[PDB]
């Protein structure tokens, strides 16, 4: 179980760690988060009290380095940094644990929520979507645009999700216009899976990462990508059975975890009604359909 030490908390902030969150008062003696489960990526995120504008945060994997957080009063944010002096790290963590100045990652033993939301998410794939190669962790915020958004403005600050466009030459074979537009199996299986993602695990990892950025940062471009990757599968007549069953599980846990009062803004009515009730896969998502109808019947 790993630890992210904080140097201090100088401005009042709501701090998230994965699906948990807590409030830190200005200059409260807060010195980090302990007992972080090894084996998964994590995200540590922030919303300032005096300006709830801009949610921002860092994706990281404690296996890849020793990371701490310190506030920068010039740039006005909590920054993740890597500690290359291991004995400094360990001594700083030990002191802060002895004084009981850290919150414990509050995972219940029965609870697989975080694993289910990140099953296919790997740090190496995150770092290709979020390009900043000098750091082992990745910054994301509410306002970052995607490569697709930018084509329709600073490239270095972009989310390089795989571009999906149903009315594009990539999605439509010359001479199969009607076929490929009404059944996206070609585009799913040949173009995206075999060609770009190489396998369904990488596809699901990007879908899962897109959802998490949408939920934790309100990142609109990420929400678009999440919905596009769902629609691409649902609008395909030919999808491997294992992918359909896995998608149903993925979406079930995403819908279960979504804050109820964010549904109006994080869920696209057209996509979900099409996917659940009209698409080729309308009868293949039993768990997701049941949770959606019991929890968001208005949307449908």
């Amino acid at each position: 179980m790993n630890t992210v030490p904080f140097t201090s908390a100088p401005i009042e902030v709501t701090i998230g760690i994965d699906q948990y969150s807590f409030n830190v008062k200005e200059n409260q003696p807060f010195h980090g988060i302990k007992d972080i489960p090894i084996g998964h990526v994590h995200v540590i995120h922030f919303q300032h009290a005096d300006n709830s504008s801009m949610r921002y945060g860092y994706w990281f994997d404690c296996r890849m380095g020793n990371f701490y957080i310190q506030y920068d009063p010039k740039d006005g944010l909590y920054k993740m940094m890597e500690e290359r002096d291991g004995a400094k790290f360990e001594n700083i963590v030990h002191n802060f644990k002895e004084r009981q100045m850290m919150v414990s990652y509050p995972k219940i033993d029965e609870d697989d929520t975080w694993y289910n939301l990140t099953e296919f998410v790997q740090m190496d794939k995150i770092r290709k979507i979020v390009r900043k190669d000098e750091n082992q962790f990745s910054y994301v915020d509410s306002s970052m645009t995607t490569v697709q958004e930018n084509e329709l403005s600073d490239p270095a600050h972009s989310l390089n999700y795989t571009v999906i466009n149903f009315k594009s030459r990539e999605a439509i074979r010359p001479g199969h216009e009607m076929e490929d537009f009404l059944d996206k199996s070609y585009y799913l299986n040949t173009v995206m899976l075999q060609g770009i993602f190489k396998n369904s695990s990488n596809y699901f990892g990007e879908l899962q990462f897109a959802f998490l950025n949408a939920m934790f940062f309100g990142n609109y471009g990420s929400s678009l990508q999440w919905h596009a990757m769902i629609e691409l599968i649902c609008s395909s007549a030919t999808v491997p059975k294992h992918m359909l069953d896995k998608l149903d599980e993925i979406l079930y846990y995403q819908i279960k975890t979504l804050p109820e009062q964010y549904s109006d803004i994080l869920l696209n009515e057209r996509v979900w009604n099409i996917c659940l009730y009209s698409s080729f896969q309308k009868n293949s998502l039993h768990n997701t359909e049941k949770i959606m109808e019991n929890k968001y019947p208005e949307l449908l």
């Binding site: 009315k167 594009s168 030459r169 439509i172 010359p174 216009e177 009607m178 537009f181």
Partner: protein, 237 residues
């Protein structure tokens, strides 16, 4: 975006544009089967592709053989329409290709956009106008060529005859849409109006009769009265 009453004169500028109307592509008669069920029998149809500035009409005849063994024919008809318009554009020299294609029914937008992905600079647009191009099959010579076709065929016409020698495109299109609206509202009465005078004929190379300017004024007034008359009959006014 959409083409409506406000931006109406754009039809007659010097940017090449085509209207595409697919309402006569898939045509059927509905009838009873021996067992007392209902079935359809297709008849030949056409794509109506019209340059409103010049009157050039590319009439692509849709022969019933294109439906043989196919399912979901109303959906296929839209895609076949888009496939044929795409093929027409590719067959035209670059300087004759349209800059815009205006579809009369919004269900044609996605099929046409998809078939035209190779032409990102050709705008595909809907219209808020209710244009009477479905009545094209009430023009005797057009209906005749469609029904006589034994295979797919394209036939070229000028839907304005020689009117542009004497009137502007705007006025020619107004005359065309008035005639077609009248044929759509009461085909028999409209044809009676056009053919009642034995001395006025249709040239071999024309679609409409050879009316003088004053005779066109009379005809146009008679068509307006027909349309109004039928409106009253319909709504009891």
């Amino acid at each position: 975006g959409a083409m409506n009453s406000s931006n109406y004169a754009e039809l007659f500028n010097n940017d090449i544009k085509l209207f595409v109307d697919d309402t006569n592509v898939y045509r059927v008669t509905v009838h009873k089967t021996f067992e007392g069920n209902v079935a359809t029998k297709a008849i030949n149809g056409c794509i109506f592709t019209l340059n409103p500035k010049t009157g050039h009409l590319f009439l692509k005849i849709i022969h019933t053989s294109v439906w043989a063994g196919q399912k979901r024919l109303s959906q296929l008809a839209k895609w076949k329409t888009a496939e044929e318009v795409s093929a027409l554009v590719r067959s035209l020299p670059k300087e004759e290709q349209p800059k815009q294609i205006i579809v009369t029914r919004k269900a044609m937008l996605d099929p046409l956009e998809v078939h035209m992905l190779d032409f990102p600079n050709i705008a595909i647009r809907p219209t808020e106008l209710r244009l009477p191009f479905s009545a094209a099959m009430s023009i005797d010579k057009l209906s005749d060529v469609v029904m006589k076709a034994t295979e797919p065929q394209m036939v070229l016409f000028n839907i304005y005859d020689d009117w542009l020698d004497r009137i502007s495109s705007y006025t020619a299109f107004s005359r065309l849409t008035l005639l077609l609206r009248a044929l759509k509202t009461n085909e028999e009465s409209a044809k009676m109006i056009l053919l009642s005078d034995p001395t006025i004929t249709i040239k071999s190379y024309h679609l409409w009769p050879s009316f003088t300017d004053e005779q066109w004024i009379t005809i146009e007034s008679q068509m307006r009265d027909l349309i109004l008359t039928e409106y009253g009959r319909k709504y009891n006014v």
